[PDB]
Structures are given as structure tokens and as C-alpha cells.
Design a protein around this ligand. Structure first.
Ligand SMILES: Nc1nc2c(ncn2[C@@H]2O[C@H](COP(=O)(O)OP(=O)(O)OP(=O)(O)O)[C@@H](O)[C@H]2O)c(=O)[nH]1
Ligand SMILES: Nc1nc2c(ncn2[C@@H]2O[C@H](COP(=O)(O)OP(=O)(O)OP(=O)(O)O)[C@@H](O)[C@H]2O)c(=O)[nH]1
Ligand SMILES: Nc1nc2c(ncn2[C@@H]2O[C@H](COP(=O)(O)OP(=O)(O)OP(=O)(O)O)[C@@H](O)[C@H]2O)c(=O)[nH]1
Ligand SMILES: Nc1nc2c(ncn2[C@@H]2O[C@H](COP(=O)(O)OP(=O)(O)OP(=O)(O)O)[C@@H](O)[C@H]2O)c(=O)[nH]1
Ligand SMILES: [Mg+2]
Ligand SMILES: [Mg+2]
Ligand SMILES: [Mg+2]
Ligand SMILES: [Mg+2]
Lengths: 435, 131, 429, 429, 435
């Protein structure tokens, strides 16, 4: 009855969404062709049923380069998606923010908005949009910045959750990542309700250490991402003792208009071999999700303070045991809250145990936790990126590509001083003040 | 930084409850009658101020705590300077706040050794510091 | 005669109410399908107070269940025991209040209050002689607190000469279910102390304590907590539903336990509470029932009575008992525990006795005491609100939907004033 | 009427109490399930003194079993005749006292006596007219000694005008069960002398000698030892539990046997004790009963009365007999055996007669002597403690948990003063 | 409800622990795969019980060289242990205390402590630690010292029992044994509640004479030590007429802070052929356990005076018989006590007869005795070890290795003086004094 649509831009969004939509069809028992064969509409919020038994997803796959999307048209999920929704261009943005925001993106933005408007009108109880985009890309960073300016105008006040891919501190696929990341953050800082952050390097440590896989390809990495996403909207599709909505994370995790950068975390992540030798009780999976070696962004929360938290259990979870486990977590002192936040926990319990994808690495479990911490420790992640941008912009390296594609050298300075204000605001609010 | 100490099995240095209470009462000038009354954490916070000037904001600590929930907040300020000072002793504040003889003597027994190691002989009154 | 209209708001109200109409149906012998299947004729003597006669001896409850988010109705309409509610009363919105005051009191609650006042008004006209309203909600949510308060203000204007009770679930000190708890609680208390006759404050942390030690349970779900609150909610009403030696009702309790118009926050209780295995080793008698009431362990709100003085106390016994033993021990309790009762209120104990014991018990009773230890609950909330409001944390989503800083100032000063009047009568002589 | 509250401490207290309740249930005709199965109504005439009535005519013992280590509680619950105790009375900790008086009096004692005092207060207020307390323990262990001392002190503080008996298993002179016996023995005896009323000292080596020689048993075990002790205790209580020609009570015994406030260390004994084979070759009569009673070899405390003088003697008979025979034999024994009787206490024999013989016996008798042979036991314990404390062994594990050498010096001084006064009153003219 | 955990350090510790855990699994009726077909809980004190019927031990196998741990992994007890609990390094300490304590052992201590903390937080009624390690071994000595320091720092006052392997006077396998033993004794003299001592040569003699085996490999010694440990823990694990605890042993056996070095003895040790021709009475098994040739440390207590004794009987044992036998033993000439210990026996009785490992050398018995004696005869062993250390250190041998691996001669000098002070204190306490 209540609807939410998802938009995937760039290669990272399409590849992640390809693994995410495989999970939804498994949870609701949807065959790849669209037909159908705690437990008990459910699929209505994500799948729009047609006249026949076919259910088509509410997804809009958009990219400029047609290489990745053509795999979806050919792959096993060929008859599921709506043929028109897969929007493709001719040439990529080529890791250039200007190309995907001023020159090439402008020729396709009108086609995308037409399909978005057609999906919204077909539905009645639209909640908000979920956007899966990267940060170092050209059409995943310069185009999703154009979508925010357009979506926020057609629809005034709606939830807009983003699932970004933070550039790693040491691991780096591109060389112009500091240029695209700084420009994107300055523009989508006023058109994003909350932006969950994920780093690619941090997932490698989780898969190698906890799950014990020595060959974590991008398909094994994208399986961990989809589990968090399904946990965010688990209460919309299932009935639980204490439900939450997309607006609940919105109010509970954003104390200030600019401070809306939480970092996700999942638990438990264990292999099948170690599943038989572990009790996996509520009292310790809460502890597992709080250790600094399990966070999914390469930043240690010990150096900062927790502005707010949000836990989302699911399965055979007793509401009494959650209170006891959380009460002693405030006792343990890997946790340090802020002075002006006497209450700093939000709990949501669901009655649907997490499902497993056959052929995957995760084992079947009866309990799960998806913590969404909003900590001050992410300020060190902005400082590191702001240092790379300042070093490379000093000698105007790589600038001639941006200037000649429809941007001005003055615009580069405006985004630089904006991140200086964000860094100052983040530290000043977090640090204590007299009276 | 501060030098850490341990306490597992030592003789000729275990003080009685009467002497330990006298040392606490004389050092900070209160009228404590039971060692189980140290679960509030108010006296413990002032010990850190004496050992190291500053490093503890004596305003956010409340001394008139009488329920179970401000005891937890009191300890969140007492040894939050432990991380600042580098001492790595972790205490069961979840179990300390119950006001039993079980641990309230064990921790004060360790604190006596810790206080004696880092005390250089400085003297200051607690009356104006408390008020 | 003297019918009671039941209103359930939020998620807790819809979950407590769903477990409340199970107790009432069992008490009156009403089948889940909605038709009387009972044996004793005393059950049907006063059935119109809660239920409502319809065609072919079908009884439908006189309750309306309304919540902004539609996820809760499908849990009770499509679940068991959902075939007896009238489908018209199932009122719901589109999106939840998002744990917000303004989204539950100004923006999204204003579009639904006009569709719920036309069902209360219609239910009131079919009544013979209205007695009062009942509201079950939470003080920490968005729609249970935001729009449940809006219903109180609207109803009070239409029926000023009526008595309504709120079975609120006040937040807990140890854990917080919502990060922005104080903003919703403070803005609601400032509205409750205006236009409610009496309020029964209930806690979740104290329900875990009672169920863990006294009931000796290991995994208390929310089904067992609501099953414990529902017993108290049925104890108050049972005096006007069944004949008794010394009858009482809603109006009688309000007169005896509200000395001043701003002091109507009660702390409920219950007895006996025993485990399944340790029930054959106890003699069920009034002696040990009154002993179980007055110990601080068996209190439904996380407030130790030893920190304050009982202003007034009322106990509603049930079952069949001698009338001498009842008065003999409230004198002994008052004489022995003479230091925890106020001095300028003599004989501050109200007694009522019914004659129908509950299902599967020889005798039981309910304790409702207006104490002064409640002041420690309002002192804690007003402390948390001050810390957050000074830094303006989370406030720029309460201003963006109608409210302003000026509204917050009144809610804090009013709550601080009520604390001062609550303590002034404790040390007064 | 005249209810008695039973408290059991440590492994020894728990086992002795289990045997004692076995004997009491057999005497009163109470089925192990907890319901009356007996025939005569004289058992039901006075059953509230020990047992407690409960719904469905059940009977629950008025016992409070408590010990730090949970092994004894698990054994008593899982074994037979554990289905009648009230589970609330089952109180235990997690870690044992480890044969440490400091650990049993200052570390686990706090919470354990808080819970135990709560239960004791509830039981006492449930009782109609309290008569006294009973505590069975050992002076050699840690938990039993220290925590029984703490319980005795708290009960003395709460109920000053009440009687309590302590059945203490004193350490043996020949072989010591624990290496550090004297410290615990001295501290416990000091506290008991301070704040108890009467104490029946019982040894283990004397019981073993009695079982091997008189009973003619090849493998005497703790079951038989506890059987003998429980038989003595039941014989003590039967005087007020049952009607008789010349009744006696606990207060009567205390008044008659305690001449001075510091002299309440009695030596018990039982008659008749015969082997299974040689029981049909003896004529059961008061002459031979008294003859078996009044010989040192039939003494349950390892002290030879020939080394001292009987300050006072009490004799509780059972069964049916003749007062003429009883008093005539008492006079004959006193006249023939005058040498070891105190001269300045004329008429130093108290006699009571009941009317119900024990199970499977025509008649029996229990003898309780307040003599001056305990001086040797106190002297031996004091000498051992003096040596150990002079060399300062095992003491840093009493100093490391609160105590100090001042307490040890005070306890030793008190023990020496007590033994000196005992000797000086033995040798008085 | 009462939990104690075991840490095995070094090859000797790992092998002894393997034998001990085989014995425990046999005793509690646990299959090698973790399933199962006075006794019920019992196994709760050692085996943590998971979601299924599988029980996993509370053991932390830690080593630096992976050979023995890989052997354990490949062995028949593969499905029992938790795979994460087995911790290995890359290279061994190589009989170097400096290498095992300062350089290498500092790189795995954090992981070991994290696993220990997780295991301790899993349980609720933690009692103490049982540490199985040797003395000659470099990794054993160094890591035992490090673990002692870390555990004493983390957990304040808990029982920490150790089952050492004292170097034999003649039988030996290393050359730096005096150095390693002196250093480890000086380091962990203040972090041990009670340290039971076991020697290889005495067990060799016992197995040669009493049991009549002429090929006594290490398996028989491991079985004997495991039997002793199980006899010690039987009081906790099972019910009995007179129970004792770890704190009971600790209190009754340590009279002075430094004198906490008791020696163990077991009875009866007879083969299968000699079992049918013996009565096995309580008095004669007490005499056998009190005989000098049955002691498991190469030192005859006739040269010393007993300070404390602890008898532990298991089986069909009558307290009257125990009392009579102990009185006779006290009367006997060869048993001499100290003047300030008028009471010198602590007696425990258990109702569970000892079990027999199939294929084992020992035969089934219905009565067993474990005798722990704190005496003065260990002073001669301390003096011999001190003399060996002084003779080797007089001309600075292997000190170049020790100094090069992050140590200075000051540590050697302080260890020497501390050992001399300990020997002086032991002799002074043991000897009589007037008044
Ligand atoms: N976690 C995750 N990240 C991915 C995956 N595939 C690509 N990425 C991220 O995407 C980045 C590559 O840039 P993209 O955002 O994909 O750019 P694009 O979509 O190819 O568009 P152009 O920049 O115009 O070429 C890499 O740095 C990766 O971090 C994936 O499968 N999983
Ligand atoms: N006693 C009891 N309390 C409950 C139960 N379920 C929820 N609660 C309490 O009710 C609060 C839920 O907030 P609500 O007022 O119901 O909010 P909502 O109905 O979900 O609507 P929103 O505020 O917009 O999210 C929680 O903080 C719980 O403490 C229950 O089953 N029993
Ligand atoms: N008569 C008799 N005495 C017993 C029996 N069992 C134990 N004892 C005595 O009681 C003492 C036992 O010490 P306890 O006080 O029970 O100590 P615990 O319960 O084991 O716990 P700790 O004090 O910490 O050691 C022993 O010294 C025995 O002499 C018994 O069955 N009969
Ligand atoms: N009783 C007994 N002792 C053993 C056994 N295995 C090894 N040892 C002892 O262990 C000593 C060898 O030193 P370890 O502690 O094992 O040293 P490691 O584990 O090989 O590691 P490194 O010290 O680095 O060489 C030998 O002197 C033996 O006395 C065994 O199975 N039983
Ligand atoms: Mg691309
Ligand atoms: Mg809601
Ligand atoms: Mg014990
Ligand atoms: Mg090795």
C-alpha cells in the first residue's frame, strides 16, 4: 500500500542492484520470470503486479555507457525488469564530473525524469527514493547530482536515502577520485535526507577475517551490501513487535541539517563451518556489531563520539533480552556518547528471519543486526579527502579536462571552502562546550 | 601519563575497612560510614582531580545522586579520564553500582595502590573545589 | 447503562487493546465470533457498558482503533480474534508520524482527526447514558502521543462533563526506545495535565523486573507484558460491571484520590503474582494479598515509594472475602507504615470489594496509589529536555512543521512548575 | 501456636536438616508429597509448630535452607523428599566461601543475609505467635560459620525478646577436616558467646565411637550420624510438640539449664542405643534407660564428664512410664553419683515426660548436660589458635578481606576469659 | 553455573590438554564429534552447549609453531574444538625466553586476550583459569609470563592454577633450562595462586616400577597428569559427601604468599594383572599415596617437614575409614609436620569413581586418592636449579642470544637475587624457631 522506488546510476549502482533485486525475489518467493509458485501485501511495496501473475520491480536502471546494462538484458534476470526502464546512452562520462553533469548527462536527464514521473503516478502511497551510486565515478557522481536537483523540485519533501561508495584511503581504482568526491558532496549536501556510507576496503577485511575467504571478488562483496539494504526496509514488508519506517531513521539520526552521514554495520557475518560451533544469542551479536574491527567504513569509532545509534533486529528476538544487552553496552566503554544526547538508542524488532542466497557465503541464521551509527569519527574521513584535493589542486593538475567541458575554475574553490565549513561544523558540534 | 599497578596477592599491605574508610574520609573531608557507600562515584572523581590537576570537568559530575541511573553517568565521567591518563584498568561499573561489599572493596583496594604510586605530596582543600 | 467508550491510539495502544479485549471477552463469556456462549446469567446482566448489542445476539465492542501507519491494522484485522470488531472503526492513515510531535499533531494528525470525531460522536448518540472515555497510548511515540493528545483536546470540548482516563506508558530511565524521547514526552505532559481527569503511568523496565523475579520468567515477550497491564486495566472497571458488597466506579475513584486538580498521576499494582510451579505452596488469603501490594518490588512504575509519601491509596479487591479482614489490615498497614503516609490526610485508604473472582483464581485485587515518588520521574525527564533543548538538537524538525521555540518554552516551565507543587505537599504539615 | 523457624547453613546444616525433616515427617505422618496420610488425630492436634498449612490441605515445612555453593541445594532438590520445600526458601550464591570466615561474613554475607532476612521477616510475620529459632551449622567451615554468625546477629537485633538454639558441629581433636580450623572456630565461638542463648555442641569422633562400639556398625556413615543428631533434636522438640504428664518447653529448658549468661554449652545424649541383633535380649525399662544415659561412653561430645562436674542436667523421657520410677531412679543416680555433681546447686536435675513414643520403640530418653568438661575443648582450641596466630600463618587471607589482627586478639582474649571463668566456677565451694 | 577455563601453552601443554580433553569427553559421555547419545548440570562447567546438541570445550590452544596444532586439527578430535580458538604463529620461540616474551609473543598476545575475553564474557559464573605449560620451553615460559601479567591486569582476583613441568635433575632435553626456569619463576612468582609441580623422571620411575611398562612414551605421562587434573576437578564437576573447590585448595594449601608450590601424587597406580590380586582398601591406598616412591617430583619429603596436605578420595569411601587411616598416618614415624601447624589435613570425598580410557595402561578401580602436599623438600630442587644457573652464568653463556633479543643483564641479576631471597624465605619458614 505504501510505495518506494529505487534508482540505480553508474556501474556500481547497477552491479549492486543486480544482486539486491536477486535477494528480494528470494524473500517473497518470486521466480526470475516474474511468476509465483512470521509467514503469511508484502511484495506490493516493491513489486507492481500487472494484470497477469507477473510482478515487475519498481526500479529504474540508468547508465551512459551501455556495456553493463547489456549484461542485465542478457542475464538470467532478463524477463523480470520492464524493458523500457533500462535506460542507456552512447558514451560514458569517462571519470569526468563535468561530462556527466553538464555535457552528456543533460541530453538524457529528460528521458529519466519521464519514467520516474510515470512510476510515481502509477503508485498511491509513495514514501521516497533509494539511490545506489558511487563517488569516484563520472556518471555515478556527476549524474546522480543532477538527479537530486531535479527530483527535489518535482517532489518537494520526500525521503531520499543514498547508498554511496566512499573512496578508500589506500585502495584506489581511479586517480581523479578527490576531484569528483569533493564536487559531488558540495552539491548533494542540500538534496539528501541521509546518506549511508560504505567503503570498499573495509569489506575486504570483513570477508577475509570473519568469513575466511581469500578470493573476495566483487560479487561476494555485493552480497554483504544487499543484506543491509534489505534490513533497512524489512519493517515495511513484514510485521514486527516494534516497527520502523523510512521516516524513523530520518528523525532519529540527523541532529543537525548538515550532519546526515551515518555508517552502516551488519552482524553476524560468519561462515558455514563456524556456524555450528557458535550459540549466536542476542546478548553477543549486539557486542559483535559494536567492535571496531567489524565497522564497514575504514574509520575507528574510538577516536570519536556517538551522536546517535539505531539497531534493527530480526528473527527470534525477545524484547527483554535486547534491553539487557543494550543496557550493558552503555556500561562497556568502547562507547562514548555526547553530553547533549542523554538518550542515544533506537530499537526496531522484526519477526522475519534473514534469508540466504543459494550458492552464497553466508550461512543460515535466526538473528541479525543492522546498526546505523552516526558518529563524529567520520570527520577524519573528510579531512583525509580534503587533503588530497588541496594537494592536487595546488598545481592545477587534471583541471584542463574539467574547465574545457563546461566548468569554471572559480567553481572549484566554492566546493573547497564548503567542505571546510562542513569539517568545522562537524568537530565543533561534537566537542563539548561550556554551559 | 601515569604508571599502572596490579593487585592479585600481596601481604603486609592489605588495610582494614576501618583504616581504608579513615583514609578516604580524611583525604576529602566527608562523613562516610560504610565502604559500600562509595558506589556513587562522587568521592572517586575528586581523587582524579587531586592526582592530576584538571583532566576532569568537576561540573558535569553530580554528588547528590541517589538513584540507580545517575550512578552510571557518574562513572562515565570518573574514569573517562582513565583513557586520557592512559591507565587501562576496566572496572565492572554494571556490578559496582549495586552497592555491595563484593567489589566496592576490591576497587578501592586497587585505587589505594594506584593513588600511592602517582602521589607526589601535593595538598589542596576540597571544600571550594566541591562548591 | 453507564457505557464506556474505548479509544486506542498508536502501536502500543493497538497491542495493549488487542490483549485487553481478550480478557473482557473471557470475563463475559463472549466467543471470538462475537456471540454469547457463557453459562452464568450474571455475565449478561451488565454487558452494554463495554459491548454493544447487534442483530442476532451478536456483540461488537464499543472501541475504535486508529493509528497513522497502516501496518498495525493488518496484524489485528487479519489475525485471530479480529472477526468481532466493526470494520468502520478501523481508521488508519497513509504514513507514520515518524516519532514526531508536529507530524502527529499538526500535519498528518489534522487530516485524520475529522474522520475519527465522526465515529466517536456517532458512538456517543447510540449510548443510553455515557459514563466516560478510555485512552491507551504511549508518551514516546509520534501518533500515540501526538494525535492521542489531539483527541483528548477535541473530546474535552464536546463533552466537558465527562471523565476520561489515559493508560499511558511513560518512558524508562535506563534504556531509551527513541533517541528523541524527552521532546515528545514533555510536549505531551504539558497537554495531559490540562484536560484529563486521571492518568495511570506504567513502565516497561518495571514490567521486566516484575516478570523476571516475581513471575520467574526467562524470555518475557511483549505478549506477557501486555497480559499483565490488561489485568490492571480490567480491575478498575469491574466494580461497575458486577455486583459487590461495597461498589465503586470511575467517578468514585477520581473524587477520593485527586486532592488537587493538577495531581492525578497514579502508580498501579496487582496481586497475587506467582509462578506456575510455586502456586500450590501459598495460602490464598487477604493477609498475604495486602502484603504483596505495599512492597516496592511489586510496583508497576519504576519509582520507589520509599522516596515519597502516599497522598491517597485505593485498593479494589475481587473474589469473595470476609469484610472484616479487609478493614483490619488496612488499619495495620497504616499503623505499621505510618511514616510513608501524609499527615494532613487522615484515613487515606479507599476500599472497594467485588464478588466475581477472575478466571482461574480464588481471589485477587488491584492497587492504585497516588504517591509523591512520581516527582522523581518528572525531574528526570525535565533534566534530559533541558540538556537537548539548550543545544537545539533535533529541534529543526519540530519547527519545520508548524511549531516554534516559543511553544517549547511553555512546555518546560509548566512541567517544572508541576514538580514544585508536587514536592511542596510532601514536606507540608 | 508457638511456631519455630528452622534455618540451615552450609553442607552440614543442609544434610542434618534433610534428615531432621525426614524424621519429623515420619513422626507426624506426613507423606513426602506433602499431604497428611496418618491415622491418629494427635499428630494433627499440634502441627503448626513446625509445618505450615497451604491450599489443598498441603503442608510445607517452615525451613529456610541457604548455602553459598549451589551443589547442596541441587542435591536436596533432585533427591527424594525434595518436593515439599518451598522453592522461595531455596537461597544460594555462586562461589563458595572457601573455608574463609572473612569471605563468609563480609563478602557474600551482605547480599545473602539481605535476601535471607527478607524471607525470615516474611515467614515471621506469617507466623501467629513466634516461639523461637533453630540453626544447625558447623564451627569449622567458612560459609556455615560466618554466615550463621551474621544471621544470628541480625536476628538478635531484629527480635531481642526471643529464644534460639544452635546445633554446632564442633571440630574434632584427633583429626582435623580443614587445616585452618582454629581461626573460624574461635571467631564463631566468640560471636556465639556474645549473642546466642543456648548451644548444643556435637562432635563427630564421639559419634563415630558411639556407632562403632555401641551400635556395632562396621561402616558408619554421615547418614547414620545425621540420623542420630536428628533423633536427638526431635527428642528435644517433642516435649512441646506433644502432650504429656509433665510438659517442658524451650524456655523452661533454658531457664533450668542456664545459670549464668555465658554458660550455655550443653552436651547431648540419647538412649537406648542397641544393635539390630541384640535388641530382643534387653528389657526396655527406665532403670536400664537411665543407666545407659548416664555413662560417658554414651556421650555425643568428646569430653569425659569424669574430668568435671555436672552444673545442671535435663532429662526428657518419651513413651509411657511411671513418674515414681523416674524420680526414684533420678534420686538414686544423684545419691550414688554425688561426687561429680556441683555442691552449691542442690536439686540439680530437671525431668520432663512426654506421652508419644518414637517410631518403632516402646520408650526412649534424651539427656542434656550443662557440665564443666567443655573447658578442655575451649582450652585446646585456644592453644591451637594461639600457636597459629603467634607464627602468623594463613592470616593475610583474613586480613586481605577486611579483618585485622585486633579482631583475632579480642577473640582470643574472650575465649581465654570464658575458659578461666568456667574453671573458676567448676572449682567453687 | 560455575565455569572455569583452561589455557594450554606450548607443545607440552597442548599434548597434555589433548589427553585431558579426551578424558573429559569420556567422563561426560560426549562423542568425539561433540554430540552425546550424579549425572544429568555437570558438562555445563566445562562444555558450552550450543544451539544443537553439540558441546564445545572452553579451551584456548595457543602456540607459536603450528606443527602440533595442525596435528591436533588433523587428528580425530577435529570436529570438537572451536576452529577460532586454536591460535598459531609463524615461527617458534626456539627455547629463547627473550624471543617468546619480548619480540615474537607480543604479536599474538592481543588475539589471545581477545579470545579469552570473549570466552569469559560468554559465561556467567566464571571461577578461574587452569594453565597447562612447561618450564624449559621458550614459548611456554615467555607466553605463560605474558599471559599471567595480562590476565592479572585484566581480571583482578581470580584463581589461576598452573600445572607446570619441573625440569628433572638428570633427564633433560635442553641446555638453557636453568635460564628459562629462573626467569619464568621470578616473573610469575607474584601472579600465581597455586602452581602444582610435575616432573618427568619421577613419572618415568613410577610407570617403570608400579605399573610395569618398559616402553613408557609421553602418552602414559600425559594420561597420568590428566587423571590427576580430573581428580582435582571432580569435586566441582560432581556431587559428593564432602565437597571442595578451587578456592578451598587455594586457601588450605597456601599459608604464605610466596610458598605456593605444592606437589601432587596419585593412587593407586597398578596394572591389570596385579589388580585381581589386591583388595584396594582405603588405609592401604592412603599408605601407597603417602609412600615416598610414589611422589611425582624427584624429592623425598623425608628431608623436609610437611606444611599442608590435601587428600581427595573418589569412589566407595567411608569417612570413618578415612579418619582412622589418616589418624594412623599422622601417628606414623616417617610423617613429620611443622610445629606451628597442629592441624594439617584437608579431606574431600566424591561419589564418582574414576573412569578408564580404553586401551589405557591403568585398570578399573572403585577407589582413588589424589594427594596434594605443600612441603619443604622443594627447597633442595630450588637450590639445585639456582646452582645450575649460577654455574652457567658465571662466564656469560647464551647471554649473547638473550641480550641480542631485547634483554639486559639486569634482568638476570634481579632474577638471581629474587630466587636467592625466595630460597632463604622458604628455609627460614620451614625451620623451627624458639618462642
Ligand atoms: N562495492 C562495489 N563497488 C564497485 C563495484 N563496481 C564498481 N565499484 C566502484 O565503482 C568505481 C568505478 O567508478 P564508477 O562509479 O563505476 O563509474 P562508472 O559507473 O563506470 O561511470 P564512468 O565514471 O563514467 O566510467 C570503483 O572505484 C569501485 O569502487 C562493485 O561491484 N561493488
Ligand atoms: N507495554 C508495551 N509497550 C509497547 C509495546 N509496543 C511498543 N511499546 C512502546 O510504545 C512505543 C512505540 O511508539 P508508538 O507511540 O507506538 O509510535 P508508533 O505507533 O509506532 O508511531 P510512530 O511514533 O510514528 O512511529 C515504544 O517506545 C515502546 O516503548 C508493547 O507491545 N507493550
Ligand atoms: N555430622 C556431620 N558433619 C558433617 C557432615 N558433612 C559435613 N560435616 C562437617 O561440616 C564441615 C563442612 O564445612 P561447611 O561448613 O559445610 O563448608 P562448605 O559448605 O563445604 O563451604 P565452605 O565453608 O566454603 O568450605 C566439615 O568440616 C564436616 O566436619 C555430615 O554429613 N554430618
Ligand atoms: N610430561 C610431558 N612433557 C612434555 C611433553 N612434551 C614436551 N614436554 C616437555 O616440554 C619440553 C620442551 O619444551 P616446550 O615447552 O615443549 O617448548 P616448545 O613447545 O617445543 O616450543 P619452544 O620453547 O619454542 O621450543 C621438554 O623438555 C619436555 O620435558 C609431554 O608430552 N609430556
Ligand atoms: Mg562508467
Ligand atoms: Mg508508528
Ligand atoms: Mg560449601
Ligand atoms: Mg615448540
Amino acid at each position: 500500500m505504501r510505495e518506494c522506488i529505487s534508482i540505480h546510476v553508474g556501474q556500481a549502482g547497477v552491479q549492486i542492484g543486480n544482486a539486491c533485486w536477486e535477494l528480494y525475489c528470494l524473500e517473497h518467493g518470486i521466480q526470475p520470470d516474474g511468476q509465483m509458485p512470521h509467514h503469511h501485501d508484502s511484495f506490493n511495496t516493491f513489486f507492481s503486479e500487472t494484470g497477469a501473475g507477473k510482478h515487475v520491480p519498481r526500479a529504474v536502471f540508468v547508465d551512459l555507457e551501455p556495456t553493463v546494462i547489456d549484461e542485465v538484458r542478457t542475464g538470467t534476470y532478463r524477463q523480470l525488469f520492464h524493458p523500457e526502464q533500462l535506460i542507456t546512452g552512447k558514451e560514458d562520462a569517462a571519470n569526468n564530473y563535468a561530462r556527466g553533469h553538464y555535457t552528456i548527462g543533460k541530453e538524457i536527464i529528460d528521458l529519466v525524469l519521464d519514467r520516474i514521473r510515470k512510476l510515481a503516478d502509477q503508485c498511491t502511497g509513495l514514501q521516497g527514493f533509494l539511490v545506489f551510486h558511487s563517488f569516484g565515478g563520472g556518471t555515478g557522481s556527476g549524474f546522480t547530482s543532477l538527479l537530486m536537483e531535479r527530483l527535489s523540485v518535482d517532489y518537494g519533501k520526500k525521503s531520499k536515502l543514498e547508498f554511496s561508495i566512499y573512496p578508500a584511503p589506500q585502495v584506489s581504482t581511479a586517480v581523479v577520485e578527490p576531484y569528483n568526491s569533493i564536487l559531488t558532496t558540495h552539491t548533494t549536501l542540500e538534496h539528501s535526507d541521509c546518506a549511508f556510507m560504505v567503503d570498499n576496503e573495509a569489506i575486504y577485511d570483513i570477508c577475509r577475517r570473519n568469513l575466511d575467504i581469500e578470493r573476495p571478488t566483487y560479487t561476494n562483496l555485493n552480497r554483504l551490501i544487499s543484506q543491509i539494504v534489505s534490513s533497512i526496509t524489512a519493517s515495511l514488508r513484514f510485521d514486527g513487535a516494534l516497527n520502523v519506517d523510512l521516516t524513523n531513521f530520518q528523525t532519529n539520526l540527523v541532529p543537525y541539517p548538515r550532519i546526515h552521514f551515518p555508517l552502516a554495520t551488519y552482524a553476524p557475518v560468519i561462515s558455514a563451518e563456524k556456524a555450528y560451533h557458535e550459540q549466536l544469542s542476542v546478548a553477543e551479536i549486539t557486542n559483535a556489531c559494536f567492535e571496531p574491527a567489524n565497522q564497514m567504513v575504514k574509520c575507528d569509532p574510538r577516536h570519536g563520539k556517538y551522536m546517535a545509534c539505531c539497531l534493527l533486529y530480526r528473527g527470534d528476538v525477545v524484547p527483554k533480552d535486547v534491553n539487557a544487552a543494550i543496557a550493558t553496552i552503555k556500561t562497556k566503554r568502547s562507547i562514548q556518547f555526547v553530553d547533549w544526547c542523554p538518550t542515544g538508542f533506537k530499537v526496531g524488532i522484526n519477526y522475519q528471519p534473514p534469508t540466504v542466497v543459494p550458492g552464497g557465503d553466508l550461512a543460515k541464521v535466526q538473528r541479525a543486526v543492522c546498526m546505523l551509527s552516526n558518529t563524529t569519527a567520520i570527520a577524519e574521513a573528510w579531512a583525509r579527502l580534503d587533503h588530497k584535493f588541496d594537494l592536487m589542486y595546488a598545481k592545477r593538475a587534471f583541471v584542463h579536462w574539467y574547465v574545457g567541458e563546461g566548468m569554471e575554475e572559480g567553481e572549484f574553490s566554492e566546493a573547497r571552502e564548503d567542505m571546510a565549513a562542513l569539517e568545522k561544523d562537524y568537530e565543533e558540534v561534537g566537542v563539548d562546550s561550556v554551559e | 601519563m601515569a604508571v599502572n599497578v596490579y593487585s592479585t596477592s600481596v601481604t603486609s599491605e592489605n588495610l582494614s575497612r576501618h583504616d581504608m574508610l579513615a583514609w578516604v574520609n580524611d583525604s576529602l573531608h566527608l562523613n562516610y560510614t560504610k565502604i559500600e557507600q562509595l558506589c556513587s562515584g562522587a568521592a572517586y572523581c575528586q581523587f582524579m582531580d587531586m592526582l592530576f590537576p584538571g583532566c576532569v570537568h568537576l561540573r558535569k559530575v553530580k554528588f547528590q545522586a541517589k538513584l540507580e541511573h545517575e550512578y552510571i553517568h557518574n562513572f562515565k565521567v570518573l574514569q573517562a579520564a582513565f583513557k586520557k591518563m592512559g591507565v587501562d584498568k576496566i572496572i565492572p561499573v554494571e556490578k559496582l553500582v549495586k552497592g555491595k561489599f563484593q567489589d566496592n572493596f576490591e576497587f578501592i583496594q586497587w585505587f589505594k595502590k594506584f593513588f600511592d604510586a602517582n602521589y607526589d605530596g601535593k595538598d589542596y582543600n576540597p571544600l571550594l573545589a566541591r562548591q | 447503562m453507564r457505557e464506556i467508550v474505548h479509544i486506542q491510539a498508536g502501536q502500543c495502544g493497538n497491542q495493549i487493546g488487542a490483549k485487553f479485549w481478550e480478557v473482557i471477552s473471557d470475563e463475559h463469556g463472549i466467543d471470538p465470533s462475537g456471540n454469547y456462549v457463557g453459562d452464568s446469567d450474571l455475565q449478561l446482566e451488565r454487558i452494554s457498558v463495554y459491548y454493544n448489542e447487534a442483530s442476532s445476539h451478536k456483540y461488537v465492542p464499543r472501541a475504535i482503533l486508529v493509528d497513522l501507519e497502516p501496518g498495525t491494522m493488518d496484524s489485528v484485522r487479519s489475525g485471530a480474534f479480529g472477526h468481532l470488531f466493526r470494520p468502520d472503526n478501523f481508521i488508519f492513515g497513509q504514513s507514520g508520524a515518524g516519532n514526531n510531535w508536529a507530524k502527529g499533531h499538526y500535519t498528518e494528525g489534522a487530516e485524520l482527526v475529522d474522520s475519527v470525531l465522526d465515529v466517536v460522536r456517532k458512538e456517543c448518540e447510540n449510548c443510553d447514558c455515557l459514563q466516560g472515555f478510555q485512552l491507551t497510548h504511549s508518551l514516546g511515540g509520534g501518533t500515540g502521543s501526538g494525535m492521542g493528545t489531539l483527541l483528548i483536546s477535541k473530546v474535552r470540548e464536546e463533552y466537558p462533563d465527562r471523565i476520561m482516563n489515559t493508560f499511558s506508558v511513560v518512558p524508562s530511565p535506563k534504556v531509551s526506545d527513541t533517541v528523541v524521547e524527552p521532546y515528545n514526552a514533555t510536549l505531551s505532559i504539558h497537554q495531559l495535565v490540562e484536560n484529563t481527569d486521571e492518568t495511570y503511568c506504567i513502565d516497561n523496565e518495571a514490567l521486566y523486573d516484575i516478570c523476571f523475579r516475581t513471575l520467574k520468567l526467562a524470555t518475557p515477550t511483549y505478549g506477557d507484558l501486555n497480559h499483565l497491564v490488561s489485568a490492571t486495566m480490567s480491575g478498575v472497571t469491574t466494580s461497575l460491571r458486577f455486583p459487590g458488597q461495597l461498589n465503586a466506579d470511575l467517578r468514585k475513584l477520581a473524587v477520593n484520590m485527586v486532592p488537587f486538580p493538577r495531581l492525578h498521576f497514579f502508580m498501579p499494582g496487582f496481586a497475587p503474582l506467582t509462578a506456575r510451579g510455586s502456586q500450590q505452596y501459598r495460602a490464598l488469603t487477604v493477609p498475604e494479598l495486602t502484603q504483596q501490594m505495599f512492597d516496592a518490588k511489586n510496583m508497576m512504575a519504576a519509582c520507589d515509594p520509599r522516596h515519597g509519601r502516599y497522598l491517597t491509596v485505593a485498593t479494589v479487591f475481587r473474589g469473595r472475602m470476609s469484610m472484616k479482614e479487609v478493614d483490619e489490615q488496612m488499619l495495620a498497614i497504616q499503623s505499621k507504615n505510618s511514616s510513608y503516609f501524609v499527615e494532613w490526610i487522615p484515613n487515606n485508604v479507599k476500599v472497594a470489594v467485588c464478588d466475581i473472582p477472575p478466571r482461574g483464581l480464588k481471589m485477587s485485587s488491584t492497587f492504585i496509589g497516588n504517591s509523591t515518588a512520581i516527582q522523581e520521574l518528572f525531574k528526570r525527564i525535565s533534566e534530559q529536555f533541558t540538556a537537548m533543548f539548550r543545544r537545539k538538537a533535533f529541534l529543526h524538525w519540530y519547527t519545520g512543521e508548524g511549531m516554534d521555540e516559543m511553544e517549547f518554552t511553555e512546555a518546560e516551565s509548566n512541567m517544572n512548575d508541576l514538580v514544585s507543587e508536587y514536592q511542596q505537599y510532601q514536606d507540608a504539615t
